[PDB]
Ligand binder design. Structure first.
Ligand SMILES: Nc1ncnc2c1ncn2[C@@H]1O[C@H](COP(=O)(O)OP(=O)(O)OP(O)(O)=S)[C@@H](O)[C@H]1O
Ligand SMILES: Nc1ncnc2c1ncn2[C@@H]1O[C@H](COP(=O)(O)OP(=O)(O)OP(O)(O)=S)[C@@H](O)[C@H]1O
Ligand SMILES: Nc1ncnc2c1ncn2[C@@H]1O[C@H](COP(=O)(O)OP(=O)(O)OP(O)(O)=S)[C@@H](O)[C@H]1O
Ligand SMILES: Nc1ncnc2c1ncn2[C@@H]1O[C@H](COP(=O)(O)OP(=O)(O)O)[C@@H](O)[C@H]1O
Ligand SMILES: [Mg+2]
Ligand SMILES: [Mg+2]
Ligand SMILES: [Mg+2]
Lengths: 261, 325, 319, 329, 348, 261
DNA sequence: GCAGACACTACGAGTACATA
DNA sequence: TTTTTTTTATGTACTCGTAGTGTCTGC
């Protein structure tokens, strides 16, 4: 028996819109610690992890380690019918083949139950190494979304550089290069605007733009964002979503050109 | 000063006196300019004959450098020339007068066969209504892709292929301007392989001079890869004089030794069979078979099998020609 | 001032200066003198005088009220579905004081370019306001105009101008411009005109500007002989399976710089109206289309056109 | 320490490593010195080195730091419409030539637009390139690469200097293959390398692929002719003799049996056409029989190039050669 | 699970036939610098099994854990097309002909995004990813011309195993870029050995006569042989040597169509045969297989001096069918030409 | 080395929004006197002559004279994400292609370096006659924009006349005519709203309303505009920017033919 | 000073067709 | 005396619906 209750309905209504055009399905792993989602995209470029602990739910019942697989083309239409500040309960039986979402109508007069068929998918955990990254930085969330949106009008792919000075975004296209930098934003009143550096070894890697925009579609879930990079490890984009848990994004770099001699 | 330019762009006939061939047409257009009676022109012909150079020389003769941007509107296939462009910038350029100095304006539509027929139908009353204010010049390679209403409104000049007799002095000017050592057989090979096209003549001249340093018949036919006349005569003699296996071995050795292609061999053999006094039933069969072989070479087909079929097309007709007697 | 070319300088301003189609032009003269003209659609070849006849009729009918009682629309205008609804109908509703027998005239020049929906919207504004406004449409292809519009108008069809009709106008222009000439040069101008007065005036202007005298050599130095009369001899040679003369005509057309697409278009246009057996004509047309597919693919050489000629000669001797 | 296949590992980095294409290599070597580079049109059979020559020339002209600023490479793997030619190619060609080589080597004052596999572009998109090539020729160069030059329109053919890449001769191909095998510590017999350059038929990419795969199959020992015949897809001579005996017998059932036996053995129909053509032109048949049979072979090869079914084309060719071999009996 | 999927071998050492080719394929993919592969042969020869064996040789046992991923691609006409994809954590499997003539839009946009991106985990996954393009002979030439620079540029980090039936439909630029691996059909003895092994693993006893008849009726298709053997046990467990083997319905319908062609030669019979050919084309039978079955049944009714002309006409109208777009025109043209020829032969 | 410094970003935004649908590409002619830009439109009917003085910039250095041809849609996309109160630095090297626009975010924290690639247009210099005009009118720019917008509703081509009395506008359209005549409006408390007549000979000329409406978009640059008209020289719309420079718009008259009658 | 309402153009989207 | 439906692959053109958005009115 899986029976969970949310404290805010805006968490799903901000976390499923980033996964609407990014991943084709949502696979939830049920455990006593919490719910874990690890989904790789169809092009094998992006990897989405979402760990919501059991301490953040209003209530949480889990007896067996179960895995549920739901689609996105129906859950995205179901989520738009739901409200914003209401409560969402997720229900799943031991032997049934459906997942029930029970919430309140936006008219706030009746309870709405929606059932989704459980897709039996055969996946395996890829396994993140959780190694020491050569660069860790902290950035504002909405500022990072505006940065990723401003490079969309220039080039189809972006270049992320990270020395000890800060984080440099570059966009080289047929129009011309767009280079922006953020450095030393500790002298502000808001704690979420602190652009800080945490590691030493500089890294320069070219990533895609569409997947970064899909990553920045989940910006008002958290206050700050974290970016981790290394010489060959994919880019890690970390959101600390309130108290119930956190989300990780893995984006593979592009193949570098033959600039040798 | 010197510039890094191709010889088809470094040597462009900036004036009308530097073009070589179409002397009556150029004299008529020069008298159009001098009498101030320039009509809407339609320049059509094969590529590399000097239509764009003609209209650019006429535009440079008609207008000065201080006013050239306000009098000439030049549009080609690299620009958008839809019906919104005809109703937009072209109609506003036609319906308004000049800025700096008085004069009639010039709309050049290079590669006018690439225009849509909606745009060509919108062009008709723009050309007819503003004849006194602006002039139109259409340039095309295919006259059938221009509507007959636009062909009525313009006086058409056929810029035919350049004859090799008038083609020689311009090539000699380019040779003397570039310090190129060329023989008479090299110039003959240039005007033969160009086939009424100064672009490919200058391109083959520049390629041969860069590849070998001299321009002779051997260097031109080696840089181009074209077979010589003696090679084609040998191929025809082998196909008409001996059996399948010996002719196949000789033609295969000639193609492997000199690196010949079957398209040029087919072209020269097709030029040869109209010179050889064949019977009419033999000639029809040869033309049909060679057209089939040339059509088969346009896709991913093995060239050895097509060479064997080329030998086969004459080995069929050998007995027929001899038994005709 | 810049002097107009002879096409635009010698455009007729009265309906009696228009040569060719004598009965239709005479009835238009009667209608311009009297009034109460029905809705009119003039179809024909280019350069026949359809726009000239419509504009002369409108000018002679309206007189000094031409600026406020005429609406002229071209293919250079928008004239879509939103212009027939909003501009043409508002002009048809517009009050214009005119003498008796005179109506507002909505000239729709080059009516092939109008879409089907605009012509459908034109029908009821043609039928309702017919006591105050009239319509004068000019076109080349009459099948582009829909059948309700052709039923709502008198469909006048202009034929191609003959040699004497163009010769009279050429004599008028020559006597106006003091152009010296011979009879052979005027015959060459008629030959290059091919029933087109625009091409006749353009070729006469070009020859007189380039050489100052009109004989056959000065005309043929700048102008060109027509294509399908020479293509028809090649098709006649292909009918009798005479491949040598057909290739002579084909190679003469090839060395003149004509592309394979223009040559095969002329071959198809001759073979459409040629005088031979109908089954043989269909075999010829199918072989021409088979060759034209190869021309459009990219293989367009002299050998391909020679193979087309050889296949057309094969079609004769294959019952 | 990733492993890379030998086709990309032995790609020519400079124009001196390009084999057998002496005229275009001489032209590009002169243009390296400072001569006027014209617009280029490379055309020829697959695997002759059309892409490698222009990429090595661009690497020698611009170096590593100016390849991204001076070379615009567009092939059929990306979209090339008429609007891509009107917008992207024209805006690239209208740019100024900026940047200088930091290693002291000379830099040419133009850009290079490499329109590889230009067969697939439409005629309107090719017509939109014409005044772009003519007007902007002071600051950019164009290199069209194709396999069939008839698919490129006559104005673009006239504007470009045409170079035909010949198939590689047996001497040069054998020399290059032996040099590659010497650089890879691979021993290959004379019969093996002779059958390799016979099979590859002027395709050096196919030869390098076969040499690498025969190295990987044997594990590092000597490559013999048996490994080359195993990896080359060459039909055995007993099958060809059985096909000719079945067509000599005049029975259509034996013909269907040998055609089904060749189809069930997975043999390619083009390989059978090549081997049957070699047997026919190296036989003692009469000229008329050889003539019709080679004409049918050419028609069957054309039909197979248009994606017809192999079984029906081979049974039609076998019926034709059966009629030819049974008419004279 | 059927017998075609229950006893399929997993590794290259467990194959029952083409064992020398299996050892050569094991030696080829050991180093990791193996080129692009083009696995070709008749249908049911075992090409897909050997492709999955090569994949299991390259990667771990996680290759067999598969999933369905749907990708939406925008055409140049801006019509969105959804295409399915068999995927794993190490390889990808695309059949672009499911997008029809939009297959090039699969190659130009969906494939390059696979090729331009490196692997997320280079420890579990190798330095390269493998993309299996299934049925590349059904690709249009535009998709094959879009394939080649993606194959050349990203070969070091993205390998391709193309699979087809005939390499004649593959353009020479693609065939020049890949190593062609020929998988012939198993022989009658090999199919008998495979069927005997499957029956003994199932606990059943299979005679040599029934195994030989199944192998001969299967036309050297091991998939169809295993399906026919399973249908034979189902319908009758005691295996008689003369037990009736079931047959597919479209083959019998094609045989009766050819018998109807033979029986009468009249425009009304041509109308009825055209109705039968629409019935065959409606059931998604490919028109080349209709042509092959029509030839294989019409040659059983012709005489000795007509079969070559019938075969040449069948090849000619098959070529015209491939050059065209409406199959019923060329199929009915072949039937009408055969009717005219057969009437001429019977009356004279 | 070229380095100009716009003191505020609003003037460049107003200039590049005035020319956006009119000018194909921007040719910045650079000297020690300032920045000049003489560019025709795509239809070759209008002409734009913008002159920015060196004293109007914050810092202006120019060693050798330049002529930078750059695209305008790219510069419009660059200047769209630019503030109105921040300094904007224009940088260019001697033999490079990067024209650099360096500014700050509207958040006023991070830098933004947007490069553009220079074009090669080598267009010939168009000679401004700089002769005296038979009619010079000082009028407010907002009233000129309002009267052009009001005349765009009636017709498409507008006959503008000027005499000793004042400027007169006529639009003979399909609904009818609109004749607006304004004169001697100097008797207000404002100084910008005034109609002044300087020169003598009356002129009547017809112009397209689309180019006039494009010219009126420079209204926030200058409070008072000048109209210069004569029988031969074109119509000049002169905006005098307060402490940066001036902007001249040249519009050619349409060809009008009288009735034969 | 800031929320509601008005028309404005840019942009997405569907459909037809392309010859003599 | 007899009528239902979406494929062909781009390029262009037309027509209609929708959505930011600048500006005006009002308390
Ligand atoms: N008559 C000529 N006299 C001298 N040089 C010529 C002549 N015709 C062509 N050329 C040369 O060829 C170059 C290109 O000729 P163009 O004027 O472009 O011919 P074209 O008729 O416009 O060909 P198309 O149809 O546009 S491809 C010129 O720059 C000259 O170098
Ligand atoms: N019948 C004619 N009599 C005298 N001059 C004529 C005649 N037809 C044409 N012209 C001359 O040719 C010019 C063009 O005539 P138009 O009437 O514009 O041609 P059109 O009949 O409208 O053909 P299209 O289809 O519009 S190209 C006129 O200005 C005259 O100078
Ligand atoms: N002439 C050559 N000299 C040296 N190596 C060559 C040559 N031709 C081919 N190769 C090798 O084979 C590979 C293929 O060469 P390519 O340049 O791609 O052939 P290609 O002309 O592009 O064939 P197409 O037309 O693109 S299928 C190269 O990367 C080299 O490794
Ligand atoms: N070596 C083998 N041993 C046993 N069964 C096999 C073997 N190879 C193939 N098969 C069976 O034969 C069938 C062949 O199908 P497949 O592997 O898809 O080949 P193809 O792709 O040529 O159709 C498969 O269902 C498989 O189970
Ligand atoms: Mg030109
Ligand atoms: Mg007209
Ligand atoms: Mg290549």
């Amino acid at each position: 028996m899986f029976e969970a209750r949310l404290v805010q309905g805006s968490i799903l209504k901000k976390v499923l819109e980033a996964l609407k055009d990014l991943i084709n399905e949502a696979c939830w792993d049920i455990s006593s610690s919490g719910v874990n989602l690890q989904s790789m995209d169809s092009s094998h470029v992006s990897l989405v992890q979402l760990t919501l602990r059991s301490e953040g739910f209003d209530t949480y019942r889990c007896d067996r380690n179960l895995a549920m697989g739901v689609n996105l083309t129906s859950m995205s239409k179901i989520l738009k019918c739901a409200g914003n500040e209401d409560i969402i309960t997720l229900r799943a039986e031991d032997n049934a083949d459906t997942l029930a979402l029970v919430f309140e109508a936006p008219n706030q007069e009746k309870v709405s139950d929606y059932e989704m068929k459980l897709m039996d998918l055969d996946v395996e955990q890829l396994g993140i190494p959780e190694q020491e990254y050569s660069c860790v930085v902290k950035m504002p969330s909405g500022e990072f979304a505006r940065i990723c949106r401003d490079l969309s009008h220039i080039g189809d792919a972006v270049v992320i550089s990270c020395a000890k000075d800060g984080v440099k975004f570059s966009a080289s296209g047929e129009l011309g290069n767009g280079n922006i930098k953020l450095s030393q934003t500790s002298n502000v009143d808001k704690e979420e605007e602190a652009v800080t550096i945490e590691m030493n070894e500089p890294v320069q890697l070219t990533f895609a733009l569409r997947y970064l925009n899909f990553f920045t579609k989940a910006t008002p879930l958290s206050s700050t964002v974290t970016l981790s990079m290394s010489a060959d490890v994919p880019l890690v984009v970390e959101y600390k979503i309130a108290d119930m848990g956190h989300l990780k994004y893995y984006l593979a770099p592009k193949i570098e050109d033959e600039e040798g001699s | 000063k010197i510039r890094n330019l191709p010889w088809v762009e470094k040597y462009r006939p900036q004036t009308l006196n530097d073009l070589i061939s179409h002397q009556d047409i150029l004299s008529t257009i020069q008298k159009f300019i001098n009498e101030d009676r320039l009509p809407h022109l339609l320049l059509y012909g094969p590529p590399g004959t000097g239509k764009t150079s003609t209209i650019l020389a006429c535009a440079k003769q008609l207008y000065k450098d201080k006013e050239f941007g306000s009098m000439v509107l030049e549009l080609n296939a690299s620009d958008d020339r839809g019906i919104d462009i005809i109703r937009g910038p072209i109609l506003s350029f036609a319906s308004t007068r000049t800025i700096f100095k008085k004069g009639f304006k010039l709309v050049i539509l290079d590669e006018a066969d690439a225009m849509t027929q909606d745009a060509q139908n919108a062009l008709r009353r723009v050309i007819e209504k503003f004849t006194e204010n602006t002039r139109f010049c259409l340039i095309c390679n295919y006259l059938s892709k221009i509507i007959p209403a636009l062909q009525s409104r313009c006086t058409r000049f056929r810029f035919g292929p350049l004859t090799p007799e008038l083609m020689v002095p311009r090539l000699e000017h380019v040779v003397e301007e570039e310090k190129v050592d060329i023989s008479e057989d090299g110039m003959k090979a240039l005007v033969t392989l160009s086939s009424g096209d100064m672009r490919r003549a200058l391109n083959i001249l520049q390629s041969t001079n860069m590849a070998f340093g001299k321009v002779t018949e051997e260097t031109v036919y080696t840089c181009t890869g074209h077979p010589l006349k003696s090679d084609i005569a040998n191929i025809l003699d082998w196909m008409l004089n001996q059996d399948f296996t010996t002719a196949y071995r000789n033609i295969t050795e000639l193609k492997t030794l000199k690196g010949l292609a079957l398209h040029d061999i087919l072209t020269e053999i097709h030029l040869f069979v109209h010179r050889v006094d064949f019977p009419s039933s033999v000639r029809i069969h040869l033309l049909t078979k060679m057209a089939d072989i040339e059509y088969r070479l346009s896709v991913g087909t093995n060239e050895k099998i097509q060479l064997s079929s080329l030998i086969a097309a004459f080995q069929v007709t050998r007995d027929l020609i001899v038994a005709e007697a | 001032h810049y002097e107009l070319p002879w096409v635009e300088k010698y455009r007729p301003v009265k309906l009696n200066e228009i040569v060719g189609n004598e009965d239709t032009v005479s009835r238009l003269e009667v209608f311009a003198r009297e009034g109460n003209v029905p809705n009119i659609i003039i179809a024909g070849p280019p350069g026949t005088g359809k726009t000239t006849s419509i504009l002369c009729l409108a000018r002679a009918l309206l007189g000094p009220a031409l600026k406020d009682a005429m609406l002229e629309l071209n293919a250079s205008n928008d004239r879509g579905i939103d212009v027939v609804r909003n501009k043409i109908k508002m002009f048809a509703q517009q009050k214009v004081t005119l003498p008796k027998g005179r109506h507002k005239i909505i000239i729709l020049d080059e009516a092939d370019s109008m879409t089907d929906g605009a012509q459908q919207a034109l029908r009821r504004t043609m039928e309702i306001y017919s006591k105050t406004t009239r319509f004068a449409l000019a076109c080349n292809a009459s099948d582009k105009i829909i059948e309700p519009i052709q039923s709502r108008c008198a469909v006048l069809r202009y034929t191609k101008l003959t040699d004497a009709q163009i010769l009279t106008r050429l004599m008028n222009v020559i006597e106006k411009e003091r152009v010296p000439y011979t009879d052979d040069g005027l015959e060459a101008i008629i030959f290059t005109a091919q029933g087109d007065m625009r091409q006749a005036l353009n070729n006469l202007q070009s020859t007189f500007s380039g050489f100052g005298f009109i004989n056959s050599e000065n005309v043929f130095k700048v102008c060109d002989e027509p294509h399908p009369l020479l293509v028809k001899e090649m098709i006649q040679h292909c009918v009798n399976a005479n491949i040598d003369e057909a290739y002579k005509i084909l190679a003469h057309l090839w060395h003149l710089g004509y592309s394979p697409e223009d040559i095969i278009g002329n071959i198809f246009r001759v073979c459409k109206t040629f005088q031979m057996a109908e089954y043989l004509k269909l075999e010829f047309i199918k072989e021409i289309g088979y060759t034209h597919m190869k021309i459009a693919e990219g293989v367009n050489s002299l050998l391909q056109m020679a193979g087309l000629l050889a296949r057309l000669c094969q079609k004769t001797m294959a019952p | 320490a990733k492993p890379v296949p030998w086709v990309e590992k032995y790609r020519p980095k400079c124009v001196d490593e390009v084999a057998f294409q002496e005229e275009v290599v001489a032209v590009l070597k002169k243009s390296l010195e400072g001569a006027d580079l014209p617009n280029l049109l490379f055309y020829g059979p697959p695997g002759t080195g059309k892409t490698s020559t222009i990429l090595a020339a661009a690497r020698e002209l611009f170096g590593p730091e100016l390849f991204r600023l001076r070379v615009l490479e567009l092939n059929a793997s990306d979209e090339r419409g008429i609007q891509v030619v009107r917008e992207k190619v024209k805006n690239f060609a209208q740019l100024t030539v900026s940047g200088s080589r930091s290693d002291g080597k000379p830099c040419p004052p133009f850009k290079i637009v490499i329109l590889d596999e230009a067969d697939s572009m439409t005629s309107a998109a090719q017509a939109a390139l014409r005044r772009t090539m003519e007007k902007e020729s002071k600051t950019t160069r164009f290199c069209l690469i194709c396999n069939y030059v008839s698919r490129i329109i006559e104005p673009l053919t006239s504007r470009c200097s045409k170079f035909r890449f010949k198939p590689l001769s047996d001497k040069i191909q054998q020399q290059r293959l032996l040099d590659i095998a010497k650089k890879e510590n691979v021993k290959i017999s004379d019969e093996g390398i002779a059958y390799l350059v016979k099979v590859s038929e002027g395709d050096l990419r196919k030869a390098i692929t076969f040499l690498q795969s025969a190295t990987r199959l044997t594990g590092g020992k000597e490559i013999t002719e048996k490994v080359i015949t195993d990896i080359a897809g060459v039909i055995p001579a007993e099958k060809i003799d059985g096909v000719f005996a079945a067509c000599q017998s005049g029975s259509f059932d034996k013909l269907e049996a040998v055609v089904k036996d060749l189809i069930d053995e997975g043999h390619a129909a083009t390989q059978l056409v090549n081997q049957l053509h070699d047997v026919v032109v190296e036989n003692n048949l009469s000229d008329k029989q050889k003539s019709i049979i080679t004409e049918k072979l050419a028609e069957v090869d054309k039909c197979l190039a248009d994606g017809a079914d192999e079984h029906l084309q081979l049974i039609s060719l076998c019926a034709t050669v059966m009629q030819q071999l049974s008419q004279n009996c | 699970s059927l017998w075609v999927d229950k006893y399929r071998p997993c590794s290259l050492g467990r194959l029952d036939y083409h064992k020398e080719q299996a050892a050569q394929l094991r030696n080829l993919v050991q180093c990791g610098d193996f080129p692009h592969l083009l696995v070709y042969g008749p249908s049911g020869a075992g090409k897909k099994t050997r492709i999955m064996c090569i994949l299991r040789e390259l990667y771990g046992v996680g290759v067999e854990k598969l999933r369905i991923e749907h990708q939406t691609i925008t055409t140049p006409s801006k019509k969105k097309i959804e295409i399915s994809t068999i995927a794993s954590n190490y390889h990808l499997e695309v059949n672009p002909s499911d997008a029809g003539n939009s297959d090039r839009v699969v190659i130009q946009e969906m494939l390059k995004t696979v090729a331009q991106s490196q692997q997320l985990e280079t420890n579990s996954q190798r330095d390269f990813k493998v993309v299996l393009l299934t049925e590349v002979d059904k690709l249009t030439k535009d998709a094959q011309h879009a394939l080649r620079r993606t194959m050349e540029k990203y070969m070091s980090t993205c390998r391709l195993i193309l699979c087809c039936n005939s390499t004649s439909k593959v353009i020479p630029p693609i065939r020049s870029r890949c190593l062609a691996v020929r998988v012939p059909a198993p022989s009658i003895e090999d199919i008998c050995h495979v069927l005997s092994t499957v029956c003994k693993k199932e606990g059943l006893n299979l005679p040599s006569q029934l195994a030989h008849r199944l192998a001969e009726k299967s036309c050297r298709n091991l998939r169809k042989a295993l399906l026919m053997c399973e249908a034979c046990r189902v319908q009758q467990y005691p295996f008689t040597a003369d037990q009736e083997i079931p047959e597919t319905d479209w083959e019998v319908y094609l045989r009766e169509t050819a018998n109807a062609i033979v029986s009468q030669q009249t425009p009304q019979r041509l109308l009825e045969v055209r109705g039968r050919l629409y019935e065959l084309l409606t059931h998604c039978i490919p028109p080349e297989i209709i042509m092959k079955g029509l030839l294989s049944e019409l040659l059983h009714n012709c005489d000795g001096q007509l079969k070559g002309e019938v075969a040449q006409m069948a090849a000619y109208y098959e070529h015209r069918l491939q050059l065209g777009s409406k199959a019923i025109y060329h199929l009915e043209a072949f039937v009408a030409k055969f009717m005219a020829l057969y009437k001429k032969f019977m009356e004279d």
